[model samples]
Target: MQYKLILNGKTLKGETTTEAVDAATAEKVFKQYANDNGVDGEWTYDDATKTFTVTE
Candidate 1:
């Protein structure tokens, strides 16, 4: 699976892998990218609902 992470419609990160079934998984991967790149933002994930929300 591949995921694209964007901030304000700007591409900030991208990931390619074999997993990531839901938004929570996507959010976790995006968070790791943010942390590694020192991207400043707030993000949350709801596993039950499979949703991801991000704010700057």
Candidate 2:
């Protein structure tokens, strides 16, 4: 199963890739993804829920 990544209520991910299964992985995945996409800004994660949020 794929974990959840959120940015302004929108999900971010690529085909055959789900890098947010855990906090450790998500921290890197989400940030790099954001930088690569243009969502560059503050990124936060909720370990309790394993969710990622991007705040610009």
Candidate 3:
């Protein structure tokens, strides 16, 4: 199944991008993003839109 990525962080900065990807790619992508940038260190999955919302 295809999944979407949603990113969020503390103090909320920059433009957030949401993308459609696969399961394996999702976690990898999130990990990279977190490392490259600063994240809030919290998240949840959305069943409605098949999205993983990574938030602060």
Candidate 4:
């Protein structure tokens, strides 16, 4: 149960996998991105397989 985050706004992998984040947690997590002036290009989370990928 983790989500991958891309901070480069492209195919640049800034960070990978994180603690289990639910809907509420996810919202707050994304907010952190905005606070950093970073825009998430794409994001995905697969808790079943414990896989997550994001493109920024």
Each prediction's whole-model lDDT (CA): 0.56, 0.60, 0.61, 0.53
Best by lDDT: 3
lDDT tens digits, residues 11-46, model 3? Answer: 673444434446567656766776677565777776
lDDT of 2 by residue, 1-53 (tens): 34566666245533223644555675667567767878755767666776666
TM-scores, in order shown? 0.40, 0.54, 0.49, 0.37
Best-matching candidate per TM-score: 2
**Candidates arranged by lDDT, highest first:** 3, 2, 1, 4
Check candidate 1 and list the clashing pairs. none
Least accurate stretch of 10 residues (summed lDDT) in model 1?
A: 9-18
Q: Which is the winner by lDDT between candidate 3 and candidate 4? A: 3
What overall lDDT, based on C-alpha atoms, would model 1 receive against the true structure? Answer: 0.56
Residue 55 error, candidate 2, Å: 1.6
Better of 1 and 2 by TM-score: 2
lDDT of 4 by residue, 1-56 (tens): 44554444554435544565475576456557545755556656566664445455
lDDT winner, 1 or 3: 3
* Candidate 1 to native Cα RMSD, angstroms: 5.0
**Candidate with the larger TM-score of 1 and 4:** 1
Error of 3 at 22 (Å): 3.0
